[PDB]
Design a protein around this motif. Structure first.
Motif, PDB file in Angstrom:
ATOM      1  N   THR A   1       0.865  -1.182   0.000  1.00 14.39           N
ATOM      2  CA  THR A   1       0.000   0.000   0.000  1.00 14.39           C
ATOM      3  C   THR A   1       0.907   1.240   0.000  1.00 14.39           C
ATOM      4  O   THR A   1       1.703   1.417   0.925  1.00 14.39           O
ATOM      5  CB  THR A   1      -1.005  -0.058   1.163  1.00 14.39           C
ATOM      6  OG1 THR A   1      -1.454  -1.402   1.341  1.00 14.39           O
ATOM      7  CG2 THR A   1      -2.198   0.858   0.946  1.00 14.39           C
ATOM      8  N   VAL A   2       0.827   2.055  -1.069  1.00 18.81           N
ATOM      9  CA  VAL A   2       1.673   3.242  -1.258  1.00 18.81           C
ATOM     10  C   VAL A   2       0.852   4.544  -1.275  1.00 18.81           C
ATOM     11  O   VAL A   2      -0.161   4.622  -1.975  1.00 18.81           O
ATOM     12  CB  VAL A   2       2.588   3.089  -2.514  1.00 18.81           C
ATOM     13  CG1 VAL A   2       3.378   4.363  -2.817  1.00 18.81           C
ATOM     14  CG2 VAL A   2       3.542   1.902  -2.369  1.00 18.81           C
ATOM     15  N   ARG A   3       1.307   5.561  -0.512  1.00 22.92           N
ATOM     16  CA  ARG A   3       0.695   6.890  -0.444  1.00 22.92           C
ATOM     17  C   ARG A   3       1.547   7.847  -1.294  1.00 22.92           C
ATOM     18  O   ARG A   3       2.728   8.045  -0.994  1.00 22.92           O
ATOM     19  CB  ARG A   3       0.587   7.367   1.013  1.00 22.92           C
ATOM     20  CG  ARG A   3      -0.441   8.475   1.221  1.00 22.92           C
ATOM     21  CD  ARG A   3      -0.470   8.972   2.653  1.00 22.92           C
ATOM     22  NE  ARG A   3      -1.172   8.053   3.549  1.00 22.92           N
ATOM     23  CZ  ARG A   3      -2.461   8.144   3.864  1.00 22.92           C
ATOM     24  NH1 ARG A   3      -3.210   9.116   3.356  1.00 22.92           N
ATOM     25  NH2 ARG A   3      -3.012   7.265   4.689  1.00 22.92           N
ATOM     26  N   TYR A   4       0.955   8.409  -2.369  1.00 24.59           N
ATOM     27  CA  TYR A   4       1.641   9.292  -3.317  1.00 24.59           C
ATOM     28  C   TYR A   4       1.105  10.728  -3.372  1.00 24.59           C
ATOM     29  O   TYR A   4      -0.064  10.968  -3.060  1.00 24.59           O
ATOM     30  CB  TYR A   4       1.668   8.660  -4.728  1.00 24.59           C
ATOM     31  CG  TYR A   4       0.317   8.578  -5.410  1.00 24.59           C
ATOM     32  CD1 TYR A   4      -0.557   7.526  -5.145  1.00 24.59           C
ATOM     33  CD2 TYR A   4      -0.069   9.524  -6.356  1.00 24.59           C
ATOM     34  CE1 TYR A   4      -1.802   7.444  -5.771  1.00 24.59           C
ATOM     35  CE2 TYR A   4      -1.311   9.453  -6.988  1.00 24.59           C
ATOM     36  CZ  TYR A   4      -2.172   8.407  -6.695  1.00 24.59           C
ATOM     37  OH  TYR A   4      -3.394   8.325  -7.318  1.00 24.59           O
ATOM     38  N   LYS A   5       1.970  11.673  -3.805  1.00 22.62           N
ATOM     39  CA  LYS A   5       1.666  13.098  -3.979  1.00 22.62           C
ATOM     40  C   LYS A   5       2.608  13.705  -5.028  1.00 22.62           C
ATOM     41  O   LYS A   5       3.823  13.509  -4.946  1.00 22.62           O
ATOM     42  CB  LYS A   5       1.766  13.861  -2.645  1.00 22.62           C
ATOM     43  CG  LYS A   5       1.106  15.236  -2.678  1.00 22.62           C
ATOM     44  CD  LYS A   5       1.410  16.043  -1.424  1.00 22.62           C
ATOM     45  CE  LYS A   5       0.803  17.427  -1.459  1.00 22.62           C
ATOM     46  NZ  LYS A   5      -0.666  17.401  -1.225  1.00 22.62           N
ATOM     47  N   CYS A   6       2.043  14.438  -6.010  1.00 20.08           N
ATOM     48  CA  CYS A   6       2.788  15.072  -7.106  1.00 20.08           C
ATOM     49  C   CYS A   6       2.425  16.551  -7.308  1.00 20.08           C
ATOM     50  O   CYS A   6       1.337  16.980  -6.917  1.00 20.08           O
ATOM     51  CB  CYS A   6       2.620  14.278  -8.397  1.00 20.08           C
ATOM     52  SG  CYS A   6       3.403  12.644  -8.377  1.00 20.08           S
ATOM     53  N   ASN A   7       3.342  17.324  -7.930  1.00 14.10           N
ATOM     54  CA  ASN A   7       3.153  18.747  -8.237  1.00 14.10           C
ATOM     55  C   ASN A   7       2.301  18.941  -9.493  1.00 14.10           C
ATOM     56  O   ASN A   7       1.587  19.940  -9.604  1.00 14.10           O
ATOM     57  CB  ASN A   7       4.504  19.442  -8.431  1.00 14.10           C
ATOM     58  CG  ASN A   7       5.188  19.858  -7.153  1.00 14.10           C
ATOM     59  OD1 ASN A   7       4.687  20.689  -6.384  1.00 14.10           O
ATOM     60  ND2 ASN A   7       6.376  19.322  -6.919  1.00 14.10           N
ATOM     61  N   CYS A   8       2.399  17.991 -10.444  1.00 13.81           N
ATOM     62  CA  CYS A   8       1.703  17.994 -11.732  1.00 13.81           C
ATOM     63  C   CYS A   8       0.183  17.802 -11.618  1.00 13.81           C
ATOM     64  O   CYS A   8      -0.308  17.329 -10.590  1.00 13.81           O
ATOM     65  CB  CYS A   8       2.338  16.975 -12.677  1.00 13.81           C
ATOM     66  SG  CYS A   8       4.139  17.130 -12.830  1.00 13.81           S
ATOM     67  N   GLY A   9      -0.533  18.173 -12.685  1.00 12.65           N
ATOM     68  CA  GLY A   9      -1.989  18.093 -12.782  1.00 12.65           C
ATOM     69  C   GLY A   9      -2.583  16.698 -12.783  1.00 12.65           C
ATOM     70  O   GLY A   9      -1.854  15.699 -12.772  1.00 12.65           O
ATOM     71  N   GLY A  10      -3.914  16.642 -12.801  1.00 10.66           N
ATOM     72  CA  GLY A  10      -4.684  15.403 -12.789  1.00 10.66           C
ATOM     73  C   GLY A  10      -4.707  14.763 -11.415  1.00 10.66           C
ATOM     74  O   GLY A  10      -4.983  15.444 -10.421  1.00 10.66           O
TER      75      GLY A  10
END
Lengths: 336, 49, 336
Positions: A190-199
């Motif tokens: 189980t991985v928790r992710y966050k990005c600067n890019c859209g969508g």
């Protein structure tokens, strides 16, 4: 079994070998030297005497190996300052060792893949000689002197450490630059992710995800497991969605005052004269010589005798008291 | 980004064992031991002076 | 093969490991350091190069293992002070080794059951200095000076030692708790027993004895030796049914006067002045500088030069002789 909620982890090192800093599974935390006998209480990143399946095995070691904990050998573990150290106790993050005079402490081990990792920390080691004689081997019977050591009682009492939750373990190896997009390889976790890019730029994924038109540096991922506990380490980051929420666990091997058997300097060649005393001092190790008058004016004089020395001391009518190392004070009286 | 660094000083776990006591001495009370050869026999007398 | 009759034995040790004293089969007796070259003659409790059946085998070792002698490996044997030592000869109780600067001598080995035993003794090791320069590495060509070392001739000549039989040895494995009584199992040996309980509570038995209504802790006994020979060691008891009956064997590595070499120091930058000489000394190792006048008053002065030094020496009418290390004394005179 306090080790149900407890677990291992990883940290950073300032010297993994040849002066190069890295993320070592044998990372040094705290080096306690409160014991007067010379015993060192070393706190490490890995766990000793426990297996990956949470079971007691003294011949086995538990270390962190790239997101997953792996097993190693107890025989492979080593402690050294300037020369190797004798290990006198191992349990979890703690190691007990008697070390010679050194300026840097080194703690290492050997993994399953036959690769050795070692962490070096600058530490000025110099135990305070016990007594007045610098011996190597401890005697079974001798002079009783007060000292301190770390006892072998496992019982949950006295000392304690702060343990917090390891929210999500950060892992940059989970992200990969797929041409001009970012691929998040889950590998059944189980991985928790966050990005600067859209969508899609947030969430808790169980499947392999791909972020279109983004860079690896503008992203962040980490595994989840808010089910295990972790010790408050300065080499590991603090849980983001948490303030000062922490727990505490009792620790083994506390410091306690005991008794140590030392030795006594050998009697010197004594020759008497007209109101004077001559001593031929033959010290094996640095021995302290002190003398005082047994009258109105004592006139205390102290000197550390190391080499072959001849000392002439004047003996007054009141008397002269001479103390040679750990030996009982020798009384001298002139007349006539 | 910011980093909050907080710290405080406490008594070590060793303070129960390893410690030095600061006393204020006022007056002293003397107590003793005298040998007396009374009637051809040595007698021990221990009393406050 | 003088090693047919010879064998090994057992004794006590002050340091068996971690500062704990025990009965070690690798117990230290005498550490001889008469050789000027640096060779140490170590006397141990066990026997090297001989098997249990009394046969010569250089790869085998003979040590005492709980009442009976057992075989071990020559490769397992080790000598160390602060760092490991190079073994340059092994025969019976004797070991020859070249050791670096240390304060405690350690001698150990590994048995058949894969268990390592080591004895540690406090010994101040530090080869003496020869000449007037404190160098580390030895030169191939230099100044010839008289010294002494232990030669490598195995030939049975000059020095010799004393040998005999074992004495009274303690053994708790001789007593056994037979229900509510104590059984003393002799096993074809002479055993000396003593008990707290009534009836027979003393004696020297050759047969199996039983003490009615007693505990093992309330008793105690020993044993004796014979047959096989042994070296007269003070760490082993004397044979009960024997006075001063003893033998003698020639020992290897005798002391002999040889010649030591001491390379020469590099010339110094010499500049002359008004009745004075200036020298810029650049020593690689501790070099001795000495100077004297070539007249009525010589006024000898000596100093050990270690760092970059500038020396100004006054040259009288008679002349000044300066000796810089192993170089041929220099001569200087005032120009008319």
């Amino acid at each position: 079994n306090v080790y149900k909620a407890t677990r291992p982890y990883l940290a950073h090192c300032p010297d993994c070998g040849e002066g190069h800093s890295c993320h070592s599974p044998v990372a040094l935390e705290r080096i306690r030297n409160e014991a007067t006998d010379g015993t060192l209480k070393i706190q490490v990143s890995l766990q000793i005497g426990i297996k990956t399946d949470d079971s007691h095995d003294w011949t086995k070691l538990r270390y962190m190996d790239n997101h997953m904990p792996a097993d190693a050998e107890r025989a492979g573990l080593f402690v050294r300052t300037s020369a190797p150290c004798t290990i006198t106790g191992t349990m979890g993050h703690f190691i007990l060792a008697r070390c010679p005079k050194g300026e840097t402490l080194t703690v290492g081990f050997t993994d399953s893949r036959k690769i050795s990792h070692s962490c070096t920390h600058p530490f000025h080691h110099d135990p305070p000689v016990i007594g007045r004689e610098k011996f190597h081997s401890r005697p079974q019977h001798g002079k009783e002197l007060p000292c301190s050591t770390y006892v072998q009682s496992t019982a949950a009492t006295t000392e304690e450490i702060e343990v917090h939750m390891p929210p999500d373990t950060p892992d940059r190896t989970l992200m990969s630059q797929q041409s001009g997009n970012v691929k998040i390889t889950v590998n059944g976790q189980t991985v928790r992710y966050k990005c600067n890019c859209g969508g899609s730029n947030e969430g808790l994924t169980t499947t392999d995800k791909v972020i279109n038109n983004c860079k690896v540096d503008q992203c962040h991922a980490a595994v989840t497991n808010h089910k295990k506990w972790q010790y408050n380490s300065p080499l590991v980051p603090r849980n983001a969605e948490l303030g000062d929420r922490k727990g505490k666990i009792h620790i083994p091997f506390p410091l306690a005052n005991v008794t140590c058997r030392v030795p006594k300097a050998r009697n010197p060649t004594v020759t008497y004269g007209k109101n004077q005393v001559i001593m031929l001092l033959y010290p094996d190790h640095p021995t302290l010589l002190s003398y005082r008058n047994m009258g109105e004016e004592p006139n205390y004089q102290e000197e550390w005798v190391m080499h072959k020395k001849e000392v002439v001391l004047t003996v007054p009518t009141e008397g002269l008291e001479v103390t040679w190392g750990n030996n009982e004070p020798y009384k001298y009286w002139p007349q006539l | 980004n910011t980093q909050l660094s907080e710290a405080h000083v406490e008594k070590s776990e060793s303070c129960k064992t390893e410690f030095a006591s600061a006393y204020r001495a006022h007056t002293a009370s003397a107590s003793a031991k005298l040998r007396v050869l009374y009637q051809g026999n040595n007698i021990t007398v221990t009393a406050y002076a």
